[PDB]
Design a protein around this nucleic acid. Structure first.
Ligand SMILES: CO[C@@H]1[C@H](O)[C@H](n2cnc3c(=O)nc(N)[nH]c32)O[C@H]1COP(=O)(O)OP(=O)(O)OP(=O)(O)O
Ligand SMILES: [Mg+2]
Ligand SMILES: [Zn+2]
Ligand SMILES: [Zn+2]
Ligand SMILES: [Zn+2]
Ligand SMILES: [Zn+2]
Ligand SMILES: [Zn+2]
Ligand SMILES: [Zn+2]
Lengths: 257, 67, 87, 98, 82, 115, 45, 49, 576, 93, 8, 44, 479
RNA sequence: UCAAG
């Protein structure tokens, strides 16, 4: 009646990708970790825009949306930052937000490409993943865009702008042995990259005793967080959710009795 | 009208890759080769760059409302 | 309001008597004036008679204090010089 | 004023006389999509009344091969009574017979 | 009619049940006394349903025969259609 | 116009209890836990860990409606065991598993880099 | 003309179409907006 | 002077006839606009055949 | 003119008296919601806030209504107005004096519509009585009306832009009328055909067929999750059908818990072999057909449209006839919830792999078409030689068309049968056709084998040009391709001429739909007007308004149409 | 069969085949307002006025027009209060 | 679209 | 009360009940300038 | 060949040219059922996209422009001449044909909420309001100015703070429903000061002013056009359709975590019910998904000309087999909620989906004690006028069949047009009645005692009075 | 007049 002891092997580790294999774990835990990658890893992204002048062809809310989708480096400052709801100060302060300011005007005849590099942050740690560049808008001569934006901490359950990952690849039982998916014609299906079978055999023989284990992961990052940091923060955040549940449950249990 | 940041299906930033894609096409790369070189691997991401129509240049052809 | 509430149990249909039309109509002497406006707005003995119905959503018709809701309207009569077949 | 009135109202005739006027001509151009604009410009309207439910004018005819789109017709009370030209179809402008 | 020689159905019709429950509920909403003890029931319609189950609704149904006569069946006398 | 705000999915509004424990009258030693402002993430882990316990006879989770944000978890335990005890022990076990996984993932990171 | 408020300006309303006393909210006039409903050329014809 | 005839857009007698796409842009008219419609009383009307 | 005003539709007589625009009514797009019960409807919050139901203040409910008054219009569970004893209406939006907010018995607070408020739900056209049913209100946080999928069949509504009308009764008397006469559970069975109106539909039907197969075995946790969505569960886990080696429940075992009470029913699956009943294995059915439910437990059988659909003797019909309307409502909802949560584990799909068939089957279809074209050629040559003999009562042209159509139809059906033989068990077209959720054998045949003959006005494609169908064909060509036979399937793709002929056939279908709507509407209105006042009097005679006796007893036996059932006399047929 | 038989009985009740049309339905001696709701309208009203016809007000449509409770179901009977039963029982409020 | 006895 | 001009894009202040004509171009199609008050846009 | 015709005199340039403009955008038209091509021809006219490149200059009522139009991945050759690539209307979407949660049943569609957040099928709605300062009246002048409650005897309690001095709201100001876009005042002749003549925003527009223009119209009076912009994020009521006649609303929106995911991590943007395909027989949709997968992997836009004979399903399947996927396009999916593999393999591929103009926000209406008509004193008609829904004659027949006489009475009398009249007992004709004076008298009888109150719909009173004006006497007698 | 069922 106790938790299984999981293990991890990291097959690949790059700047934008982490491949790891979690073994001796339940399927529910592995899928929940995959889910927390997507929806519950906090990141800093723009959520407040005040546009002073917008002569571009794109309307103001278009520019606001594009700005929000721009990833911002949140490697270490996101843990320090507090949610805007938690902060005592009214609206936004340096402890609860990061201020970005953008001023661009096209006076040259050539079209001016407003890029993420033109976004200027008051805090050095949070930068728009620049150290090409994301194109916010293109400006004709005589067109000007000036705006002021504040970035808040949040996770992807609120909005996809706070989604740390690009694509989380989750796969278990690479050669179908628990028969969780029943192929009508086993031969036609392409073999998995993790499959251990020889070319002749399409599926592994059915194992009734076996249960899902040795889950394979591939986490890719947008550059907002280090791909290792996404996994570590997801594990820590899920642990925090469970601990909060335990505290509230203890309160209810004691109060009822 | 303009290349979308963050490919819809997965979320990979694809807004920085439009000008590079056009330049690779000018370099006589095939569209598939350009997509491979840019690092777009999943067909969801390749859809974004391959099927994008850049209307913002046509919109920029018009003179500005205020000079 | 003092009148008791009743539900119609029989509807009797008949041709209106000309004498009954004369008695029932609030307008007396008929509609003598084609114009609807006299004294500026109201034309007595005209098409828009204050006694016939409430006008302008704020006035009260002469016959009753309708206030544009209570008054059901009141009929008027035109005395044709020579009789005309009803179609 | 005569030309402007007939275009604006959609009634083909004079202002005083609407008895011989034909309604339904000169509709406002649809600008929901470029396809809608193009199809509105290339449109045919059969004069048969919509109220009549006789089905002969509505059915697709063999002679509409290549002249009128077989698929594009409004569905409802005007099935087959409004038609769209095919892509290559060209209506004749007219010439003298001399 | 006389109380004897009642020819209508002993069972309460569905329309009678609907109108009796609605009318009794409207009366209960207007602070009419409730025959049945309520077990924390505040909605008037539910209290009317409880009364109907207990057959304590103080309404007598007058059923008009097509010949013009009427037969007065009390709600208690009628067998509930349920 | 009737769209709910995005923060409503995870933020408890004032006066809302994260966990409410209501016993089940139908069967002995069964309790029905209602978790507010939570989704399949927490529910599936808790149900799985409960199912691993030999003394837990029944364990399941249900989202009553996807548009609303609530989890209902039914736990039935054998006599000499309490459903609330099983819930607490499940949470402790999940926390232990996650902590061990964090330590081993950090070690793997350190080994992969410069090694 | 709110009966309890001598010389009270009644605010017009568009939702139900009535004039309402702003200090007490009494509806004076129930549905008295309804719909609420060339003079230059020639004259009356 | 005997009156005024409405002009269908981009026909031979319209101002937009024989104009390069840059010139159409300078007049704030789309190069891809098909034409074939009258602007009567400020609204574009199409004569259904 | 006065006569013009009164006479026409939308005049005073009909457009303003028989029907009229009404207050307390709302309309918006409808979208699905499997989680809502049959009687529940999901109302948006704005619609719920605008619509108000006046509540009389009683000593019982004075506190609750006082809280609602305090909340006001802005907060959603609030009160828009207060109606005093004098009839004075205090709009709470504009500032009411704190004295005005105080409530006493007899005041009427107009609260916003809340969960559990009975409403009437309508979809035009209102063809039958089931098109207006009383629904309980559940407020959900989006701007579309949400109704359960089973309730779509009475309304004839699908969620492709449809809309429905919501009417809120404003009095306790009319609310009770709706509650006890027109609620959805009360109108499960129609008196028109003494069949249930509503049945399991779409994903739930397709998945109930798969769930009830002999193959389906469920492990412990899956059974836990499925039982979680069963509302009437006793809390006791059924003993697994396979105790060892590993405890494994069966789909029928779980569905038996859904079945209400103790219901006995015997039905046959769609694929039931005809010879099975006579031969051995009649009771131990080899194909797991012959659905039998004993003591409310599914002993055997694969559920399908026949067992759980809208037909006489269905499991739902027997539930309504035996258990009652409330338990049947729970039955519908529980089937949907449990089966839809199992479908997450199993899943359903449609792909090109379903349309494609084996190479041998394609060759067989091609050979059938080849020999059919040869037979049509032989008939044509016989007609040209005048060897053909006219069928009695028919001209030679008519009999030639008859014989050619017979040959083409036989080839079409044979190719369709070959395609249907090719289908595997895993084929999803076959899953949906066998379950009865959607599609037909004809659609499979057209998808895989042969689209078929295109007929317009009951004949092959006519000679629109002079003596030829299209300019591409030769004059006086009565062959199969020329006159409209589409040899290719949809998957294979139609040749251009076949595309045009197929367009002609589809146009005929569209025109028929458009015409039938109007003509049927007129017929229905005339029937209703002729028979509107006829009713069963307390003499149980059926009399009109004039009191003339139409029938001495209703239906000649004085019984209602919903309670009756099909039965066999069993004394009539046997010999002496 | 009940629904078919009822239509057949209404059409053949009078002894002459009554078509479900304006002619057959309106010729039957129903109330003038009920005839007015179906097709002919104003002409029916004019004829009824000429001959001094009286509307019995027993029809459903006639009662619907005047806003009264219809004689249909839930309107067939008239409920009366039972004083003796009101006295009996526990009058808690 | 099927045959003469079926549908168009 | 500053109107931008369509033809020459030069702001001209126009008083109430004054003809709508841009000085320096004569064009009669004016646009009102963007308001000074600022609107918060959620990037969402 | 085997001799059929040896006297051909002309040849077709290409058979696909029989189709028109709207039917030419359909990919693989020959693989669909004919009514479905007909339906797509109508649906394509209602799709959203950039209608014209000069849309910023144009001030049109009801203009919708999509944020990120994309050209089809599977396109017809004849689309190039239609300029569909230049001005596309729709977005290629990863579509899974599966039954996930039952919210895609019937024709509804499950959409990815994370994709919607990233800009998927987002649009802008521009509405233009025109007003003209008319001085044509002899003593009436409709001057543009900001109305003042004290100065103007006629006014409304909606917000007037937005209006500037000119009476026109400045661009960039948010406007909620029932706000004053334009303020206009008609000088009132003093027969013996001001009847308000402002224009008010359509309810629930909730937009930001984009452009405000002041000109002189054809008549020479001052003309003002105001364009209001409203972004429209897709909701669970909006209507989405493919190019193969499959239309449906959005059943529900699931986030990327909840949506089913492939092993690569690709989650469908749109999930459509498998039950739509078989009855409708739109196989062109399936072939378009297969060709779209092949095109996205290969990097070349797929060719879907109607009649090709060089493009077959088998060839597309082999091409897809080269790129590492199942040849028929099926993919193994994992359940988002639990992570278990779905036993059936779901058919996933990119498909061009369109967004139609019909949206739930424009189609939602609720009425409760609103304004009434003048002639009938019945509720108004239409969403703009806060009109109630009509309780038609078919509806009343249904209610009669129910036996719900009192609900029928409420709906047809009490909810719509309640009214009271006074009728003489001696003669059925209505009688004059002064409630305030408390004197009730009947003309023609010289009788005051015998008068009875009758409750009837106002429409019935109007009917009886119109009968009386035709000399018919509808004598309603209580006896 | 044009769409929505
Ligand atoms: C199924 O029947 C309905 C109803 O009868 C109602 N309805 C629709 N139009 C009318 C009309 O003009 N007049 C009247 N009286 N009723 C009307 O609509 C019918 C079907 O029409 P459709 O055949 O287009 O439905 P798809 O099969 O097309 O559904 P997809 O796959 O798009 O969701
Ligand atoms: Mg539909
Ligand atoms: Zn702060
Ligand atoms: Zn991607
Ligand atoms: Zn009066
Ligand atoms: Zn007051
Ligand atoms: Zn200028
Ligand atoms: Zn009198």
């Amino acid at each position: 009646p106790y938790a299984n002891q999981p293990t991890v092997r990291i097959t690949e580790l790059t700047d934008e990708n982490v491949k790891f294999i979690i073994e001796n774990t339940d399927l529910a835990v592995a899928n929940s970790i995959r889910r927390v990658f997507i929806a519950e890893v906090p990141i800093i992204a723009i959520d407040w825009v005040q546009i002073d002048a917008n002569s571009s062809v794109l309307h103001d809310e278009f520019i606001a949306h594009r700005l929000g989708l721009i990833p911002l480096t949140s490697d270490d400052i996101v843990d320090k930052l507090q949610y805007s709801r938690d902060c005592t100060c009214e609206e936004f302060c340096p402890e609860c937000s990061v201020e970005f300011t953008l001023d661009v005007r096209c006076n040259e005849d050539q079209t001016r490409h407003v890029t993420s590099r033109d976004l200027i942050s008051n805090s050095p740690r949070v930068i728009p993943v620049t150290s090409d560049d994301i194109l916010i808008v293109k400006l004709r001569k005589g067109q000007e865009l000036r705006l002021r934006a504040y970035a808040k901490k949040g996770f992807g359950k609120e909005h996809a702008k706070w989604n740390p990952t690009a694509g989380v690849a989750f796969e278990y039982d690479p050669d179908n042995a628990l028969r969780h998916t029943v192929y009508p014609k086993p031969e036609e299906w392409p073999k998995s990259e993790y499959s251990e079978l020889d070319e002749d055999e399409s599926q592994a023989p059915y194992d009734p005793n076996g249960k899902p284990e040795r889950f394979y992961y591939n986490v890719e990052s947008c550059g907002s967080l280090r791909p290792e940091t996404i996994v570590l923060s997801a594990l820590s955040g899920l642990k925090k959710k469970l601990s909060d549940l335990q505290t509230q449950l203890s309160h209810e249990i004691q109060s009822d009795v | 009208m303009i290349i979308p940041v963050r490919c819809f299906t997965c979320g990979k930033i694809v807004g920085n890759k439009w000008e590079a894609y056009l330049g690779l096409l000018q370099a006589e790369y095939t569209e598939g080769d350009a997509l491979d070189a840019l690092g777009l691997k999943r067909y969801c991401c390749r859809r974004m760059l391959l099927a994008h129509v850049d209307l913002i240049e046509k919109l920029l052809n018009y003179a500005p409302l205020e000079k | 309001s003092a009148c008791p509430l009743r539900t119609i149990k029989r509807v009797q249909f008949g041709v209106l008597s000309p004498d009954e039309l004369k008695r029932m109509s609030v307008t007396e002497g008929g509609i003598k004036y084609p114009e609807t406006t006299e004294g500026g707005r109201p034309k007595l003995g005209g098409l828009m008679d204050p006694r016939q119905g409430v006008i302008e959503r704020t006035g009260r018709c002469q016959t009753c204090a309708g206030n544009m809701t209570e008054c059901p309207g009141h009929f008027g009569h035109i005395e044709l010089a020579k009789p005309v077949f009803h179609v | 004023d005569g030309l402007k009135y007939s275009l604006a109202t959609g009634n083909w005739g004079d202002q005083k006389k609407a008895h011989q006027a034909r309604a339904g001509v000169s509709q406002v151009l649809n600008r929901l999509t470029f396809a809608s604009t193009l199809s509105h410009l290339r449109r045919l309207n059969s004069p048969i009344g919509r109220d009549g439910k006789l089905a002969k004018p509505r059915q697709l005819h063999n002679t509409l091969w290549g002249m009128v789109c077989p698929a594009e017709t409004p569905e409802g009370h005007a099935v087959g009574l409004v038609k769209n030209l095919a892509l290559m179809a060209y209506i004749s402008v007219g010439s003298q017979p001399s | 009619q006389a109380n004897q020689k009642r020819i209508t159905t002993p069972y309460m019709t569905k329309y009678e049940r609907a109108r009796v429950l609605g009318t009794r509920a409207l009366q209960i909403a207007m602070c009419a006394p409730v025959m049945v003890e309520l077990e924390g029931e505040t909605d008037p319609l539910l209290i009317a349903m409880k009364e109907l189950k207990a057959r304590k609704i103080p309404i007598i149904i007058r059923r008009y025969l097509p010949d013009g006569s009427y037969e007065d069946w009390g709600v208690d006398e009628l067998i509930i259609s349920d | 116009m009737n769209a709910p705000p995005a923060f409503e999915s995870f933020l408890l509004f004032e006066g809302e209890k994260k966990i409410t424990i209501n016993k089940d009258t139908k069967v002995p030693n069964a309790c029905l836990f209602t978790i507010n402002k939570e989704d399949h993430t927490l529910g599936n882990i808790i149900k799985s860990q409960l199912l691993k316990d030999p003394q837990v006879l029944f364990a399941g989770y249900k989202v009553p409606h996807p548009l609303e944000h609530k989890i209902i978890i039914r736990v039935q335990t054998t006599p000499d065991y309490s459903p609330q005890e099983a819930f607490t022990n499940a949470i402790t076990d999940l926390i232990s598993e996650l902590s061990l996984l964090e330590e081993r993932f950090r070690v793997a990171i350190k080994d992969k880099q410069e090694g | 003309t709110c009966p309890n408020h001598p010389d009270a300006i009644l605010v017009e309303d568009y939702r139900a179409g009535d004039m309402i006393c702003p200090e007490c909210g009494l509806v004076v006039g129930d549905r008295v907006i309804d719909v609420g409903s060339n003079p230059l050329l020639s004259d009356g014809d | 002077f005997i009156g005024k005839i409405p002009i269908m857009l981009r026909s031979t007698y319209c101002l937009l006839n024989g104009l390069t796409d840059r010139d159409l842009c300078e007049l704030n008219e789309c190069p891809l606009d098909p034409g074939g419609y009258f602007i009567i009383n400020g609204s574009e009307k199409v004569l259904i055949a | 003119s006065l006569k013009q005003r009164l006479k026409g539709k939308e005049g005073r007589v009909r457009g303003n008296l028989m029907g009229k625009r009404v207050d307390f009514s709302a309309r918006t797009v409808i979208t699905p919601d499997p989680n809502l019960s049959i009687d529940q409807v999901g109302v948006p919050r704005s619609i719920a806030a605008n619509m108000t139901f006046a509540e009389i203040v009683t000593p019982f409910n004075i506190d609750r209504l006082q809280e609602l008054v305090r909340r006001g219009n802005s907060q959603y569970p609030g009160a828009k107005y207060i109606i005093r004893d004098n009839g004075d209406r205090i709009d709470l939006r504009f500032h009411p004096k704190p004295s005005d907010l105080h409530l006493q018995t007899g005041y009427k607070v107009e609260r916003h519509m809340c969960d559990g408020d009975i409403v009437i739900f309508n979809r035009q056209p209102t063809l039958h009585k089931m098109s207006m049913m009383g629904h309980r209100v559940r407020i959900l946080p989006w701007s579309t009306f949400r109704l359960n999928l089973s309730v779509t069949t009475p309304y004839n509504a699908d969620f492709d832009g449809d809309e429905m009308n919501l009417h809120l009764p404003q009095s306790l008397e009319t609310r009770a009328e709706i509650q006890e006469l027109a609620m959805v559970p009360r109108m499960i069975v129609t008196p028109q055909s003494n069949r249930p109106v509503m049945g399991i539909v779409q994903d739930t039907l397709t998945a109930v067929r798969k769930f009830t197969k002999r193959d389906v075995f469920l492990e412990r946790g899956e059974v836990m999750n499925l039982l979680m969505f069963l509302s009437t569960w006793d809390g006791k886990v059924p003993q697994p059908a396979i105790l060892k080696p590993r405890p494994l429940w069966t789909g029928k075992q779980i569905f038996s818990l859904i079945i209400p009470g103790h219901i006995n029913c015997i039905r046959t699956h769609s694929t039931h072999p005809d010879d099975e009943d006579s031969g051995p294995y009649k009771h131990i059915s080899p194909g797991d057909t012959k659905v039998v439910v004993e003591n409310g437990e599914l002993i055997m059988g694969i559920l399908c449209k026949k067992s759980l659909g809208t037909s006489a003797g269905s499991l739902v019909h027997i539930s309504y006839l035996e258990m009652g309307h409330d338990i049947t409502r729970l039955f519908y909802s529980n089937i949907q919830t449990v089966i839809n949560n199992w479908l997450l584990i199993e899943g359903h799909t449609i792909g090109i792999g379903d349309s494609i068939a084996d190479s041998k089957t394609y060759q067989d279809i091609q050979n059938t078409i080849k020999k059919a074209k040869q037979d049509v050629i032989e008939v044509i040559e016989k007609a040209h030689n005048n060897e053909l003999e006219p069928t009695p009562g028919n001209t030679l042209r008519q009999t030639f068309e008859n014989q050619v159509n017979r040959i083409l139809n036989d080839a079409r059906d044979k190719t369709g049968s070959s395609a249907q033989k090719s289908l595997s068990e895993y084929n999803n077209f076959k899953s949906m056709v066998v379950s009865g959720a959607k599609g037909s054998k004809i659609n499979i045949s057209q998808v895989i084998a042969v689209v078929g003959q295109q007929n317009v006005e009951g004949k092959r494609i006519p000679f629109g040009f002079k003596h030829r169908t299209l300019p591409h064909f030769i004059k006086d060509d009565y062959g199969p391709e020329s006159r409209g036979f589409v040899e290719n399937s949809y998957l294979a793709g139609l040749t251009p001429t076949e595309f045009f002929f197929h367009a002609m056939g589809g146009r005929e279908g569209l025109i028929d739909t458009a015409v039938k709507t109007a003509e049927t509407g007129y017929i229905q209105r005339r029937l209703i007007k002729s028979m509107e006042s006829v009713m069963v009097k307390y003499d149980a005679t059926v009399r009109n308004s004039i009191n003339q006796v139409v029938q001495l007893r209703y239906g000649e036996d004085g019984l209602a149409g919903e309670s009756v059932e099909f039965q066999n006399l069993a004394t009539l047929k046997p010999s002496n | 069969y009940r629904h078919l038989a009822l239509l057949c009985d209404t059409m053949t009740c009078r002894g002459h085949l009554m078509a479900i049309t304006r002619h057959g339905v309106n010729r039957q001696d129903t109330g003038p307002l009920m005839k007015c709701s179906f097709e002919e309208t104003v002409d029916v009203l004019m004829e009824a006025a000429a001959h001094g016809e009286s509307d019995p007000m027993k029809g459903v449509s006639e009662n619907i027009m005047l806003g009264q409770l219809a004689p249909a179901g839930t309107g067939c009977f008239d409920l009366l209060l039972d004083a003796e039963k009101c006295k009996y029982g526990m009058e808690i409020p | 679209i099927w045959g003469i006895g079926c549908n168009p | 009360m500053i109107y931008i001009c369509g033809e020459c894009h030069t702001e001209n202040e126009i008083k109430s009940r004054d003809p709508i004509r841009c000085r320096e171009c004569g064009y009669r199609i004016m646009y009102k300038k963007r308001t000074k008050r600022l609107v918060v846009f959620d990037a969402r | 060949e085997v001799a059929y015709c040896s006297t051909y005199t002309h040849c077709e340039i290409h058979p696909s040219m029989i189709l028109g403009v709207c039917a030419s955008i359909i990919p693989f038209p020959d693989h669909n059922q004919s009514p479905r091509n007909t339906y797509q021809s109508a649906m394509g006219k209602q799709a959203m996209g950039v209608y014209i490149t000069n849309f910023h200059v144009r001030m049109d009522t009801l203009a919708h422009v999509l944020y990120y139009p994309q050209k089809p991945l599977v396109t017809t050759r004849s689309m190039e001449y239609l300029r569909f690539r230049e001005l596309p209307a729709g977005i290629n979407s990863i579509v899974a044909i599966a039954s996930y949660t039952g919210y895609n049943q019937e024709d509804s569609v499950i959409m990815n909420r994370s994709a919607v957040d990233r800009g998927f099928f987002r649009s802008v709605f521009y509405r233009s309001y025109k007003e003209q300062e008319s001085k044509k009246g002899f003593d009436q002048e409709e001057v543009f100015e900001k109305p003042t409650r004290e100065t103007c005897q006629g006014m409304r309690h909606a917000i007037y703070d937005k209006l500037d001095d000119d009476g026109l709201i400045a661009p960039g100001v948010r406007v909620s429903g029932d706000d004053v876009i334009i303020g206009k005042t008609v000088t009132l002749p003093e027969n013996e000061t001001k009847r308000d003549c402002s224009t008010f925003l359509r309810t629930s527009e909730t937009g930001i002013v984009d452009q405000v223009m002041v000109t002189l119209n054809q008549e020479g009076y001052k003309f003002c056009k105001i364009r209001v912009r409203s972004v429209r994020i897709p909701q669970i009521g909006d209507k989405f359709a493919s190019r193969h006649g499959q239309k449906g609303t959005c059943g529900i929106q699931y986030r990327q975590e909840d949506m089913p995911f492939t092993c690569e991590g690709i989650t469908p943007d749109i999930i459509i019910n498998p039950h739509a395909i078989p009855s409708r027989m739109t196989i062109g949709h399936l072939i378009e998904c297969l060709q779209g997968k092949v095109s996205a992997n290969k990097g070349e836009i797929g060719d879907a000309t109607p009649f090709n004979d060089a493009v077959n399903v088998q060839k597309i399947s082999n091409l897809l087999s080269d790129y590492g996927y199942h040849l028929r396009g099926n993919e193994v999916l994992y359940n988002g909620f639990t992570g278990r593999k779905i036993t059936s393999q779901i058919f996933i591929g990119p498909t061009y989906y369109q967004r139609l103009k019909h949206m739930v926000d424009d189609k939602i209406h609720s009425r409760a004690r609103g304004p009434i008509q003048i002639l009938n004193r019945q509720p108004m008609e239409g969403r703009s006028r806060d009109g109630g829904l009509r309780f038609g004659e078919m509806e009343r027949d249904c209610q009669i069949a129910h036996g719900a006489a009192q609900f029928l009475r409420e709906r047809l009398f009490e909810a719509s047009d309640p009214y009271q009249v006074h009728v003489c007992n001696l003669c059925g004709i209505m009688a004059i009645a002064n409630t305030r004076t408390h004197t009730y008298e009947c003309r023609g009888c010289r009788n005051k005692t015998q008068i009875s109150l009758v409750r009837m719909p106002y429409a019935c009173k109007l009917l009886f009075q119109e009968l009386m004006s035709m000399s018919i006497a509808p004598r309603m007698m209580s006896v």
